[PDB]
Design a protein around this ligand. Structure first.
Ligand SMILES: C=C(C)C(=O)SCCNC(=O)CCNC(=O)[C@H](O)C(C)(C)COP(=O)(O)OP(=O)(O)OC[C@H]1O[C@@H](n2cnc3c(N)ncnc32)[C@H](O)[C@@H]1OP(=O)(O)O
Ligand SMILES: C=C(C)C(=O)SCCNC(=O)CCNC(=O)[C@H](O)C(C)(C)COP(=O)(O)OP(=O)(O)OC[C@H]1O[C@@H](n2cnc3c(N)ncnc32)[C@H](O)[C@@H]1OP(=O)(O)O
Ligand SMILES: Cc1cc2nc3c(=O)[nH]c(=O)nc-3n(C[C@H](O)[C@H](O)[C@H](O)COP(=O)(O)OP(=O)(O)OC[C@H]3O[C@@H](n4cnc5c(N)ncnc54)[C@H](O)[C@@H]3O)c2cc1C
Ligand SMILES: Cc1cc2nc3c(=O)[nH]c(=O)nc-3n(C[C@H](O)[C@H](O)[C@H](O)COP(=O)(O)OP(=O)(O)OC[C@H]3O[C@@H](n4cnc5c(N)ncnc54)[C@H](O)[C@@H]3O)c2cc1C
Ligand SMILES: Cc1cc2nc3c(=O)[nH]c(=O)nc-3n(C[C@H](O)[C@H](O)[C@H](O)COP(=O)(O)OP(=O)(O)OC[C@H]3O[C@@H](n4cnc5c(N)ncnc54)[C@H](O)[C@@H]3O)c2cc1C
Ligand SMILES: Cc1cc2nc3c(=O)[nH]c(=O)nc-3n(C[C@H](O)[C@H](O)[C@H](O)COP(=O)(O)OP(=O)(O)OC[C@H]3O[C@@H](n4cnc5c(N)ncnc54)[C@H](O)[C@@H]3O)c2cc1C
Lengths: 384, 384, 383, 384
């Protein structure tokens, strides 16, 4: 048994899920990763094939088209998919979170209207929280939703929205009441609604397979029936979405790191310099040992958090933050060391390691930056 | 539920073991730690009290006086005891390993003769492997055991032996055959045997509660009936002992680190500078967050390895090495950060943090130094 | 300022620094993002830089050079790197090529190749690496067989910066036996039959410089183009790298300095939680670390530059230490600066991400940092 | 020339100072370091021999018995002396700082009365700032000095005072006015003064050759004529003194690290395991390269700061803080790595490396903790 075996500890059902996801990634994603990244293509066709396997609504209830899997099942799947394309898998995760928010907090009409098409990916979703003036301080958002009759009139702008322009469903966090978290509500806005526009496609370091652009609302009238949950429940929904988001983005980092470790091990054994394989150099052997050891530690952390969350444990929220902090930091380092191990080749787009580095790098900033993770964790520990 | 709760995930029986060990540590060890360290006292009376609770032969079979507990049970117990005195707990672990080697590889006569007195700690044991010329390269040991009639004549010297002088039973690795790993045998030598002498009591940075002396053999005749296992089985016995040794020393590191995190959290909340608790300083909050996150990661790694070992999994040996490498490195860093958090007070012997630092520091060198751990881990991964 | 890049410099060097920085801010910084996005080799701007004397910074004045010292050169490249690290790094490579010819060539060669390089009428590329010889540079296979007054070259070089655009290629080839002693340095000119280039490589950074394989198929080159004696090639190559490494490290310094300044200003203007980001102690402390490591890296590079110029016996080791320390520390500084910008740091609209992408490769090329440790340890353990 | 040659860049005069200092350390300090540490002995006779060479008042004006050397000359001397005993050299530096404060800010009567005896070390000095409730927040000290006729009546206590009990001259920062820095004054208190007492001799991890005791004042009458500077100038004098003290403590760290690197280099070449010198292992080779590289960087930082301070540049305060921060952190890491390179031997008191580790560790805390250094540095950066 490999010392970095990703299947150890999983039950038979999960090992199957893992195999299916990995096979899909190797066949449909890995061969196209470089192209999607270079051309900044949103892989609609491949994502829809992924949805046919049940990855469009991984942890969404089956009555609305979901696969109804657990947090751990989901982590295992995203980790495997991330070895194919971390950027694309990360977007799939965001899409899933949007569907989960509607599925978990919406009424029956909302669930059967929005979730089915998201699960088949007939339609794609984007999560709209961040604004130019509200990033880490998410609860200070300014986008307003003024209630008038049977509609909410939205005014404001969201920033860095993944999938914007391509998505048909937008889960928007807006302010319906006073200042602070309590005045925020969650409202679904559909592509095509008058008053909804988009900014330019942003050029980024990575996560290129998913379009990034501002989402703008100018006196945008939206049906009150589109509000998910009651007024003032918006930040609660956002905070609960973050627990799973932290586990899942960390799972994407795990996949990139695992792929990087495998590529590195094979490269050291094959590439020769000074008449011997690079693997003959003790310094490189030790670096690889560190990479493998920390990968195993990161995997244990992410899966431990996933189990804690699905079991509804009181330490789950803190564990999700610790796992996200630890895994995104350690996994980026692993990918970056793997790049170093490839030498000049690691800097070329023809080699996957550099994209795992570029894509995993941003995970340290999203779903609550790692600085924010430390604020949350320390607060929790010092309060006890 | 605390984000660093050490009981999470354990079964009911284990939570009880943990409670007993912790209470014993808080009552009998913690109040005396500083004194044992300052006066370099081998705490015979307290260790015997520990044995009364079943800590003298934690994972030794019950038929010979042991407690018959598992690898995970043992890790939990040593982690809890180490919060009281890491040095003393580490020695208890070494003593336990010696008893385990006899229990696991000895014949019935040897098991019932040596194990019972070790389990009650009527007698103490020392493991003798290292020599001046063989440390990391342990299989190159020179101490010879020449068969002569019904006795082996031993000649050579062992170095850094914990408990030497105080121990009545010495598990000695000697060369009965040719060069290399295959010519080593394990033989029990009892205090009082003519030809056995000890070097001076070495002064050290930590682990002061356990005497460190060279063990010298000069034409020391030992009964062939004292050989544990068959001739040439020594290497195997030492290697099997190392798997548990790595888990247990890492467990001692976990205890030191956990104690340090708790002391730090409380200190930050109580000590005031600039008119506010130290905890009000964000840099200190973030450092504590890092400490806690890595403690949880280290704990998962150690317990994961313990479970793999007791389940006899094919990845157990590699995992024990990874766990020892990760935990001893991360835990020392945690204790050292805790020292920094106490300011000048952390440098004073009146504050426990500095001994957790001094004691845990040597764990990165023992049971196979962390450099050796990387050799073993990289070798395994590169051959896959 | 505690990160004042002029401290310790003489009046002349402070003037060089000012000219270099002003040029970078006016001609490079405004175009950095575009050159990177479109992968454009800024010929016109580089020629403007050559007009200021940056085409042959440490080349002798009799052949068009500026005749400046290694320290003067470090100061200049550090300043230019704040505008575009990728482009400045190439200028450094071009300069190294000119220096090898200027320092080891005969008068005819010096006056033939150096003048056009100093005005950048022509550009140069350094060709050492091959598919099978990277860190183990002395194992190169490109052969050069003598035939009359020409050498017939056969082989291929990899990762060549400026390939295709350059007119002068300083090529390390094997004229004799195996190892370092059988290598010679030969100048190959663009347009020579038998010389071709591979595809334009796609990379993470250093996009303003084309990167292509250089292929030789029965390429006939004049024996008169050989710099130095046969078998002196590897010695010339490494001698060139000691200075090249100091200069690549200087480019890292520039990227890091720019990143620290950008971060400082960003923390003071960007507000979250009703206060500037600078009000958060962790960010204040992190900036303190960045500045402290930047000053340490600057001292290391300048210290090595002085040792190299004075030709001290500890110069080779110091250049290696400086390259190792500065490229590692500066990448970390730039990466932290990116974190400090949040999501904005990941956007191509913000310079910090290019300083990260460009400085990252400095830990690999011009002799990887693992190779640096080889050089340093050998020196330490032998004494 | 070695790549870590400590004489490179120094003028002829400084190379001679360095040689004298190193030879003295090798002959009078190195051979006794272990004993002074084990027995906690204040080496009065040896320190007086050092003063005979001009090390009692290295940067004190010559008109009062000083050597009148520059900050850079001083750094070179302390770095060299620290290779013999870091603990003792650190105290010599503190003594020097006290003498400098009197020399630089006192009136001619005080300068000629106190400085001469200090320069020959006929008398020893202690710096008294820290109190139980004021460490990093030094300006919040509580020790009061109430004027009564031509005497000040002192009440309060100081903590962690190096040399307390042995010193004849105590430079005490006390509160003569209102709250904060502006109400602090500097006053010299002589041993034997009624009302002055000392606490127990503190047990510590390192700096054992220095007695550490609390200094207590109970209605202690001290001449107003003993006040250095004007009332309210005390804190300014304290910090001006610390700028130089910080450069010197960092210099002591350089010496500990340099000695550790040399010891490691020789050890790797002589000690053999697996049939070859330890130096044959690439990981150890690379680690030594890192140690040497960081040592050179730290040396440049400290000497750079010394030059800035001597030239009274506007960036001197920030540079001194950066040098102390960088050097104390890097040097402790170097010494700790050196300990690892010695294996178990590095943990024994018979090997010098462990004391360089124990002694250099506290440099990251005292003379202004490294967290405080970051406060000073960030303030400067964000203000400009
Ligand atoms: C962006 C750009 C422009 C680029 O990336 S250009 C390509 C860059 N690639 C490199 O930097 C190559 C990395 N590799 C190297 O520098 C060398 O191959 C190593 C690995 C350090 C040494 O290789 P080895 O095969 O072991 O040769 P080695 O025996 O050390 O040296 C051969 C001779 O050169 C000498 N030498 C080596 N490095 C030297 C240096 N930096 N300065 C001066 N002399 C040097 C060395 O002392 C020896 O002399 P002799 O035996 O005659 O006394
Ligand atoms: C081993 C030994 C001998 C020892 O450990 S001795 C005891 C050592 N303890 C220390 O080093 C104390 C650590 N703390 C300090 O240095 C200071 O208390 C801090 C935390 C940096 C600043 O404290 P604050 O209360 O904020 O005072 P702050 O407003 O910064 O300063 C008061 C005045 O002193 C000045 N000052 C502060 N640090 C200075 C320095 N390093 N150099 C010159 N001036 C300084 C400062 O500019 C201010 O002047 P003004 O406002 O009049 O212009
Ligand atoms: C590729 C990409 C995709 C994205 N996709 C989406 C999406 O689909 N939907 C969406 O809503 N958003 C999305 N975002 C935005 C993301 O949520 C924010 O970028 C992130 O939360 C940080 O906010 P910011 O960029 O404004 O940085 P800031 O909040 O300004 O923070 C900048 C830096 O300061 C630190 N910081 C902030 N506050 C503190 C504090 N109190 N103490 C200490 N340090 C602090 C941060 O950790 C960070 O290092 C995306 C961003 C990127 C780059
Ligand atoms: C407090 C204490 C208690 C101890 N108790 C016992 C006991 O009870 N019984 C017993 O038998 N022993 C005991 N030991 C000894 C311990 O097992 C050895 O000290 C340890 O195994 C290392 O051997 P060494 O000290 O000879 O160091 P060395 O083996 O000489 O190694 C020195 C350094 O080189 C590194 N190194 C070695 N080989 C390589 C390689 N091939 N590649 C890279 N790096 C390498 C090491 O990791 C280390 O950093 C004790 C030691 C201490 C300090
Ligand atoms: C953008 C870019 C521009 C370049 N421009 C030029 C140019 O203009 N001219 C030119 O000649 N070359 C150029 N190069 C090539 C560069 O010199 C090589 O990429 C670099 O020297 C490493 O060689 P390699 O890529 O073959 O990696 P390898 O040599 O295969 O090494 C791979 C990894 O193994 C490590 N390693 C190798 N040997 C050892 C050892 N003995 N012990 C321990 N670790 C070891 C390396 O440090 C590295 O981490 C460029 C490269 C890039 C990415
Ligand atoms: C061996 C030894 C010798 C000494 N000798 C002397 C002497 O001769 N004379 C003398 O006056 N003093 C002496 N000291 C005391 C020394 O100056 C103090 O220990 C040190 O300044 C720290 O104060 P503290 O111990 O009260 O820790 P605290 O000030 O309580 O700080 C504890 C921790 O909090 C951090 N911290 C504090 N404030 C902040 C903040 N605002 N933001 C972030 N982090 C913060 C600190 O850096 C530290 O990590 C000595 C100490 C030792 C250990």
């Amino acid at each position: 048994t490999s010392c970095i075996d990703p299947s150890m500890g999983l039950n038979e059902e999960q090992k199957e899920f893992q195999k299916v996801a990995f096979d899909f990634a190797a066949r449909e994603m890995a061969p196209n990763m470089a192209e999607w990244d270079q051309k900044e293509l949103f892989p609609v066709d491949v994502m829809r094939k992924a949805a046919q396997l049940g990855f469009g609504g991984v942890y969404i209830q089956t009555d609305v088209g979901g696969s109804g899997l657990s947090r751990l099942d989901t982590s295992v799947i995203f980790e495997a998919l991330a070895t194919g394309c971390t950027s694309t898998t990360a977007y799939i995760s965001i899409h899933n979170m949007c569907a989960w928010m509607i599925d978990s907090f919406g009424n029956e009409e909302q669930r059967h209207k929005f979730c089915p098409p998201l699960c088949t990916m007939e339609k794609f979703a984007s999560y709209c929280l961040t604004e130019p003036g509200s990033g880490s301080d998410a609860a200070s958002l300014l986008t307003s939703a003024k209630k008038q009759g049977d509609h909410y009139i939205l005014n404001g702008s969201k920033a860095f929205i993944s999938g914007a322009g391509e998505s048909d469903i937008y889960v928007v966090m807006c302010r319906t009441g006073g200042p602070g978290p309590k005045g925020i509500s969650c409202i679904v806005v559909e592509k095509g609604t008058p008053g909804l526009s988009f900014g330019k496609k942003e050029k980024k370091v990575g996560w290129n397979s998913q379009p990034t652009r501002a989402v703008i609302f100018e006196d945008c009238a939206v049906p009150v029936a589109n509000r998910i949950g009651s007024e003032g429940q918006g930040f609660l929904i956002a905070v609960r979405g973050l627990n799973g988001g932290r586990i899942n983005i960390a799972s994407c980092s795990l996949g990139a790191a695992h792929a990087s470790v495998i590529l590195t091990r094979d490269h050291l054994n094959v590439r020769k310099q000074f008449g011997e394989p690079l693997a003959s150099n003790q310094y490189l052997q030790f670096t690889l040992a560190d990479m493998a050891t920390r990968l195993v530690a990161a995997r244990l952390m992410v899966r431990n958090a996933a189990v804690a969350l699905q079991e509804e444990r009181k330490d789950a929220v803190a564990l999700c933050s610790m796992a996200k902090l630890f895994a995104t930091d350690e996994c980026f380092a692993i990918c970056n060391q793997a790049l170093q191990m490839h030498g000049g080749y690691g800097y070329l787009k023809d080699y996957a390691v550099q994209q795992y580095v570029r894509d995993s790098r941003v995970h340290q900033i999203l779903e609550g930056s790692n600085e924010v993770m430390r604020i949350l964790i320390s607060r929790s520990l010092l309060q006890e």
